[PDB]
Amino acid sequence: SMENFQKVEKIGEGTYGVVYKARNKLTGEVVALKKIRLDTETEGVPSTAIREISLLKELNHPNIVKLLDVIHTENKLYLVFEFLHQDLKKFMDASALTGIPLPLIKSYLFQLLQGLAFCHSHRVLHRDLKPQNLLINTEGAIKLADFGLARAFGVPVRTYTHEVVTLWYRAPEILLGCKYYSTAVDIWSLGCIFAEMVTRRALFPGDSEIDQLFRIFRTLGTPDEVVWPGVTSMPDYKPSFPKWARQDFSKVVPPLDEDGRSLLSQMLHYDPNKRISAKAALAHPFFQDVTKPVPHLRL
Amino acid sequence: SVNEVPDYHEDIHTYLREMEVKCKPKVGYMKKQPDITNSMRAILVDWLVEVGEEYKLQNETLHLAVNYIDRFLSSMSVLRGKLQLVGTAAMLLASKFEEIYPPEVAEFVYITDDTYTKKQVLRMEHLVLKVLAFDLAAPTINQFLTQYFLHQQPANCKVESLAMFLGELSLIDADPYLKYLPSVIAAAAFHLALYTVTGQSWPESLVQKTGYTLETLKPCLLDLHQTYLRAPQHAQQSIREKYKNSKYHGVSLLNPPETLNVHHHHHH
């Protein structure tokens, strides 16, 4: 089965299964293999794989990672993916002192939005937009990866899994404990990423659920009925929280300009209903000048 | 608000319409199945409705199960003694796809009353995945019904739970509902609900969202109306039992309308 695939090396473990870098011996294609074991034990094929496969088959897009094949033995289960050269955080770290040229930050955002609007347009939430799950190639492309935590939603939505999104990129509505959440939760995450590319540090690097809320408040202010209706009616919410005035955006997204900050705020709106849509974000003036640059050094 | 996804509802509606076609089982498949009949399929679905209750599963889960079962039997021949096994693995897979807390395999085993071994259930699962090529995100009548409800003026939940009941009923009878798409069955179920409780019709706003006139839905409306009237005399009773309780507003106790009204479409 995998007789035609030679494993080069192991690359990571993020979410379900292990990922290897492999080479197709016959075609010459470099691929990434997601491998699941069983035993397991069990219970049959994991809901996370089932979900990733079914959705990722439907989702053909230049900015969503491409699933190439499924090799479906009694014992192992292989997912064959296009190989992307590195993740965004890696990258973002490499540029810790040099920075990322605006054009590029701009390009990567645009594409992630294009990709994410496709997701939503096809009733899929990713629910895990941490910068380890956004992969880049040498031609200046970026792509949404690992749909292990994704789901297909109904319109209108219903209560889905509470335990969702990497803590850092997790929207307040999920934090507060609402019974509904929607497309916006993905947008919140891209908002945090947007900032993360600009300053090269996590925007809200919280160490717990409460502290995460604390940090979000520290930076965006403590919300009330005016900015977001009903926040005090929310379950895990407490009036005993401090009242912070909203920090003026230059502190701390310093290099970011007029337009970017408009977008960023709109991406980081408290009210899920107020928050900008990806589709609407693609029209935003920040993106009018966009191109497709090549990532600087040998990555 | 954002929970009704205002910026994407069209692109979604269009897409599921596109996908319901691609996920449609082959219309006359039972006739090619030597050992099983539409009546036997009627018996298995009912069991699944019962299974959905024992484990408080989403109605959605039920609807996807039937979709997998239907498409499976479109390609694979299955002896009567194994039909339950197809169902179980389907119910298992749809659960895995749709449930926050899907029941464990042990629990899925325990309900066939040890007709099948854990090993067999897990193996069928695999077979079903192979046969379907992992295309488990199939559109259901539910996903259309939910969308149709936002057009209500005003939102009535006897109407909502009735349409659910009616859409659910159609899952029992391969003949005739196999020749109808989920968007269509849901359009009739919603209209028939919105007539029994209120006396309103299939609203104009939906005529242009779907394209479905009250005229084109006439064939399906008749079948549904017939099924709705015949419901207390039907062999399978679990859905009616289900929708008696306070949860679904007790809609299955309601008396179906006698006529529906309707226009002679063709003029000589």
Ligand SMILES: CC[C@H](CO)Nc1nc(NCc2ccc(-c3ccccn3)cc2)c2ncn(C(C)C)c2n1
């Ligand atoms: C989603 C996150 C995942 C989990 O670790 N990592 C990851 N990285 C990739 N490529 C970037 C990468 C990361 C690490 C290495 C690497 C190489 C040698 C040793 C250690 N790590 C090589 C490429 C890559 N391509 C495709 N997929 C999947 C299968 C869709 C990828 N998944």
